[PDB]
Amino acid sequence: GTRYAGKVVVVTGGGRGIGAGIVRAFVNSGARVVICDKDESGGRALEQELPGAVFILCDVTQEDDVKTLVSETIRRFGRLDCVVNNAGHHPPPQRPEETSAQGFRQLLELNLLGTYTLTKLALPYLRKSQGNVINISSLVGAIGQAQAVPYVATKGAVTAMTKALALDESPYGVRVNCISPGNIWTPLWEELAALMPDPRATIREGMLAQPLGRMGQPAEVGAAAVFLASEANFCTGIELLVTGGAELGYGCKPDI
Amino acid sequence: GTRYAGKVVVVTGGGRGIGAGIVRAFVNSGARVVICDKDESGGRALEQELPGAVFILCDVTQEDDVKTLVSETIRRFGRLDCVVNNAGHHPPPQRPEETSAQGFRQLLELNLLGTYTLTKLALPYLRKSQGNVINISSLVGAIGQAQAVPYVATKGAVTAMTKALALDESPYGVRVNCISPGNIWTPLWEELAALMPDPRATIREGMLAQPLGRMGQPAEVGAAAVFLASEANFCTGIELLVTGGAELGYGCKPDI
Amino acid sequence: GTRYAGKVVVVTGGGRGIGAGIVRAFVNSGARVVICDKDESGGRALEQELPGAVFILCDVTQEDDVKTLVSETIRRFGRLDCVVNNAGHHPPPQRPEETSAQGFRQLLELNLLGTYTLTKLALPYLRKSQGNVINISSLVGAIGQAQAVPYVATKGAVTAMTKALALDESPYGVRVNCISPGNIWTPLWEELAALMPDPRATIREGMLAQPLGRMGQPAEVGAAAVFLASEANFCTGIELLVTGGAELGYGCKPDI
Amino acid sequence: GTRYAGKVVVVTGGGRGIGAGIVRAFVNSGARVVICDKDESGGRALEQELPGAVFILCDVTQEDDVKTLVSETIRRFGRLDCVVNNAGHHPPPQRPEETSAQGFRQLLELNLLGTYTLTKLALPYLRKSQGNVINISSLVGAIGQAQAVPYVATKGAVTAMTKALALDESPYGVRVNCISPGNIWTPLWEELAALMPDPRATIREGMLAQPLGRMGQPAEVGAAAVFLASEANFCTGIELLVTGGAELGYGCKPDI
Ligand SMILES: NC(=O)c1ccc[n+]([C@@H]2O[C@H](COP(=O)([O-])OP(=O)(O)OC[C@H]3O[C@@H](n4cnc5c(N)ncnc54)[C@H](O)[C@@H]3O)[C@@H](O)[C@H]2O)c1
Ligand SMILES: NC(=O)c1ccc[n+]([C@@H]2O[C@H](COP(=O)([O-])OP(=O)(O)OC[C@H]3O[C@@H](n4cnc5c(N)ncnc54)[C@H](O)[C@@H]3O)[C@@H](O)[C@H]2O)c1
Ligand SMILES: NC(=O)c1ccc[n+]([C@@H]2O[C@H](COP(=O)([O-])OP(=O)(O)OC[C@H]3O[C@@H](n4cnc5c(N)ncnc54)[C@H](O)[C@@H]3O)[C@@H](O)[C@H]2O)c1
Ligand SMILES: NC(=O)c1ccc[n+]([C@@H]2O[C@H](COP(=O)([O-])OP(=O)(O)OC[C@H]3O[C@@H](n4cnc5c(N)ncnc54)[C@H](O)[C@@H]3O)[C@@H](O)[C@H]2O)c1
Ligand SMILES: Oc1cc(Oc2cccc(-c3cccc(O)c3F)n2)ccc1F
Ligand SMILES: Oc1cc(Oc2cccc(-c3cccc(O)c3F)n2)ccc1F
Ligand SMILES: Oc1cc(Oc2cccc(-c3cccc(O)c3F)n2)ccc1F
Ligand SMILES: Oc1cc(Oc2cccc(-c3cccc(O)c3F)n2)ccc1F
Ligand SMILES: OC[C@H]1O[C@@H](O)[C@H](O)[C@@H](O)[C@@H]1O
Ligand SMILES: OC[C@H]1O[C@@H](O)[C@H](O)[C@@H](O)[C@@H]1O
Ligand SMILES: OC[C@H]1O[C@@H](O)[C@H](O)[C@@H](O)[C@@H]1O
Ligand SMILES: OC[C@H]1O[C@@H](O)[C@H](O)[C@@H](O)[C@@H]1O
Ligand code: NA
Numbered sequence A, B, C, D: 001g002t003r004y005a006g007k008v009v010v011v012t013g014g015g016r017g018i019g020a021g022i023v024r025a026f027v028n029s030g031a032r033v034v035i036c037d038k039d040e041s042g043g044r045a046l047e048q049e050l051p052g053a054v055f056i057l058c059d060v061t062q063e064d065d066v067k068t069l070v071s072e073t074i075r076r077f078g079r080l081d082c083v084v085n086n087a088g089h090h091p092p093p094q095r096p097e098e099t100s101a102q103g104f105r106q107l108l109e110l111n112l113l114g115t116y117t118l119t120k121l122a123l124p125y126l127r128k129s130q131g132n133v134i135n136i137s138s139l140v141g142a143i144g145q146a147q148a149v150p151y152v153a154t155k156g157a158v159t160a161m162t163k164a165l166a167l168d169e170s171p172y173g174v175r176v177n178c179i180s181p182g183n184i185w186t187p188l189w190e191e192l193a194a195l196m197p198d199p200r201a202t203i204r205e206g207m208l209a210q211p212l213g214r215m216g217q218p219a220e221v222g223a224a225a226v227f228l229a230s231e232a233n234f235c236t237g238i239e240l241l242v243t244g245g246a247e248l249g250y251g252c253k254p255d256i
């Protein structure tokens, strides 16, 4: 209730899924939270539910939406301590020959450039507060995934960008870190599975891809984010894996 | 004060340095802590200072000392939730030709096999409590260090062993993680620097090896350990870097 | 002279620097090489110098240039075995607040989407030949670099995309790998250094960033590419570091 | 036939499996090779088969055997250019509680300290020739394996030690690299599979653990070793993965 008291946090894509879990974790740590989302439904309800959270409609691909997000956060709360760049999307499975450069550009706009834009607009305020940036990347940026060339590329970019920005902002006392979740049970996961021939088999395989034998929860990503914001004062440029061990060991992926 | 309430933690090498910082962090989180050390001086004083911590003399290279450590922890506190394998040593700088197989074996006994032995003896109790293991490795296991072949090898072993054991213990609900610190200001760091021709220059270089421009503190490693024990329920087999960004970018290490 | 005899290779950005070194290495291995470049000067001279190499003017950011590159390679040589995606650029040092989303998009077009486009257009022919893709990424995609947020992000994307595509193309026998060079002495390196206040000091620091004490040569990247094409039949999705050890150890990047 | 002509190479464990593949690759590159093995059967036959290879009986865990190996190589051939530390063993699957500290020490003696000892004794000669060291580690040192805590730890140690030694030997022009194979079809693989309830199912799973859908060959590890010795002049401290993509993507390893 006090580990991040007095602090102001912006969470993009905070209306459902991982983002909502991060919002809840920060509120529970004593922070005031601005929920940014392009969809009103979840975020508005979350603002009614949580004292200490408010909702601002903002599409992170629209530069003027993001400018207004930052200026309204400062106008309403007087400071900015942490930006969590969580908004992102995973397209349906797509074989490489079924992808397009224009779909790839669109996905870069959301998963990479939206993170870049908010971070850039927020950094002057983060420098004043010795605040920090937390980017939500993905394990698959590090190890790859099948039928997801554009998505994987966007997350490799986010993880790398996190390290570059950590170097650039270190002289100013602003830490920049990322979290790479594995399979987290969210509405995106449920929507992707529903597209498959056997959604139940897809979900079962998703649970068993982790040594821990289940998928992760938004609250577990949220606790990692609160740690990075509030207690990881010597961590910058790290990639914190929240994956249940999926990257470990051999699996289902004589010498001729 | 309550994030790890009711839990029992063993910290090896807990009498000074990083270990003492981890002890303090766990006590502050509400746990009872057993301080294991081969040196009475720091650990006994820490037991007097901290309600909730007690000291047990134990050299982790001596199997019967470790057996007694575990059986006394259970006899006195009734459960075991977390083992922090922190005891270890860094020899003075040694060029490869100045090392010996027998010095290498001795360092393996402490930095690797002591961690192995306590973990093995503790695992039956950790399974009962769905507890966890935290090994203190080192950034240099991942990236190397000059004049430290044996030390580097021992830490590469610890980090790898953490992943193997995480796979083996996942079916039983026991997580196994490691922390890889960079330069942390401790009595070991101070003792190593005092051996150098210009200790002050060695310390200054140590501070500047991190983008953050300072060395880390035992309390920062301690906060990472408390996160891994108490809030990282979907993390297993991870290497949590607490290094101030030392692994990032180019440094001081035309084409002929 | 025979390790890649009978094979046809396309090298983008092959007119100078690393690309020209890769062209020479493949010609020396017995392959026929198509030099792609947006600049006529170096590539045309290279075509006159090397029997077995020909030059095709092609800007990899222009989809119809790339379509013609592939169709002319097939029309003239009857097969395609290897694509080396080397074309790319490093902007001058830019602090994060001096970058723009539109500059970032432009750099993505070259360093990431040009690689994507040629690969996509080439893959039907690579499947027929059980050929392979080699992407030239950068060490800084993995470890970060200062004053280079957009560049670093593009190379993290390339390395990640390499892994995704390796997964997707494995059933078809097409390997996809990348090379991550460190400091290689090329016209780009020389042009960037000339912008600095003391170019000589910048170059000296560049040599000393590697434990080997020099920068690398285009011929060394070329030999790595020939290995990946011709002899690495069980390697797919790898990142082959050609960096002189720059990522190893501590450098120039008490606890307060 | 000439890429490593005039050079002298020592391959430990060269009598069968990967080691024999490395021996053959170096002979085919024009080098003279000393086959070291503790077993006479395979190595003696290989010496009869290959002009340019000779067999020396040597157990790498016995320091005086290794001293004689080096002194006989110099006496007979006048120089030493490359050491390949391939000798090693994988115990049968062992749950953590079934391992022992004394078995762990024994495995460290072979997989880690034998590599250390030969390297140390060879380095004075490698400095004279600006030669290089190649250690055969394992992918599982990096990602873990189930039922193999001691083996995994030994290979994490080898990979880390490679980086440390690369730093130490860089001023002297001696490169130190490792190869991390995945599943390679060798007599060790066949012997381990024969211990399983269904050896055929174990082998089938082993083939399918790689995106490439087969296991690797000793000749493929051998080609990687020849590349590292003869053409990778700007590579030091690298871990070259020869794994068929096993580390990529998700596999067989809702949120409660
Ligand atoms: N779920 C997983 O398994 C998983 C794994 C790894 C990484 N991730 C990453 O975690 C993040 C959140 O994923 P999730 O599963 O919670 O997704 P989700 O679809 O359940 O929730 C995403 C939220 O972001 C919002 N959003 C989307 N586009 C936006 C835009 N342009 N501007 C503002 N808000 C926008 C959506 O409206 C939604 O509320 C994403 O970056 C995703 O890539 C998810
Ligand atoms: N200080 C750093 O910069 C740094 C960096 C990376 C990793 N580490 C690791 O962190 C750990 C702690 O290092 P530190 O700097 O705090 O060291 P330290 O020497 O200051 O403290 C180590 C403690 O361990 C105890 N210990 C040593 N051998 C023991 C044994 N056989 N049995 C029981 N206790 C024993 C010592 O008595 C001491 O109290 C070590 O594993 C070290 O390798 C330290
Ligand atoms: N030089 C280094 O230290 C270094 C380090 C790591 C990675 N790299 C990468 O290696 C690659 C080559 O770098 P370099 O140093 O040789 O650069 P360079 O500038 O010396 O040569 C690049 C070549 O690519 C061509 N090119 C540029 N844009 C193109 C386009 N749109 N279409 C076609 N050709 C185009 C240029 O005309 C030139 O001939 C780049 O991808 C770079 O990011 C270089
Ligand atoms: N086969 C795989 O899938 C695989 C995968 C990753 C790593 N590796 C590593 O590759 C190396 C070779 O493995 P392999 O599968 O070819 O094994 P193998 O058992 O088929 O051959 C090993 C050879 O080393 C010799 N050897 C063993 N102990 C020795 C000693 N004390 N002194 C000298 N020689 C000794 C054996 O007699 C034998 O000829 C090992 O280090 C192993 O850990 C193998
Ligand atoms: O970033 C990630 C996003 C994820 O979303 C989902 C959800 C359901 C299925 C899939 C999926 C699995 C295999 C291939 C593929 O293209 C997928 F989209 N990903 C899953 C894991 C991640 F690390
Ligand atoms: O595990 C580590 C242990 C460390 O201890 C120290 C302390 C002072 C100096 C050194 C040191 C620096 C360079 C070479 C060397 O051999 C050293 F011991 N390490 C420093 C960093 C780590 F990641
Ligand atoms: O991809 C790379 C590209 C490189 O180009 C150059 C050349 C000269 C200077 C720099 C440079 C150094 C520090 C910061 C920065 O922004 C630079 F551009 N990079 C150097 C290393 C790489 F890995
Ligand atoms: O170093 C390695 C050594 C290997 O040997 C073998 C051979 C057959 C089975 C196994 C194996 C598989 C799963 C668990 C386990 O304990 C094994 F030994 N490893 C396989 C892969 C490696 F990377
Ligand atoms: O839709 C899948 C899951 O999404 C998560 O974000 C919600 O917190 C869960 O209640 C829900 O089951
Ligand atoms: O000796 C160096 C440092 O060691 C740390 O463990 C102590 O907490 C500090 O008070 C001390 O300055
Ligand atoms: O311009 C720097 C260097 O670029 C390389 O590509 C050329 O091969 C060298 O001859 C030149 O010195
Ligand atoms: O025993 C399994 C395999 O081992 C390899 O080292 C040999 O080259 C193969 O001929 C054999 O099939
Ligand atoms: Na509210």
Ligand code: NA
Binding pocket: B046, B047, B048, B049, B050, B051, B052, B053, B054
């Ligand atoms: Na006490």
Ligand code: NA
Binding pocket: C046, C047, C048, C049, C050, C051, C052, C053, C054
């Ligand atoms: Na020509």
Ligand code: NA
Binding pocket: D046, D047, D048, D049, D050, D051, D052, D053, D054
């Ligand atoms: Na012979």
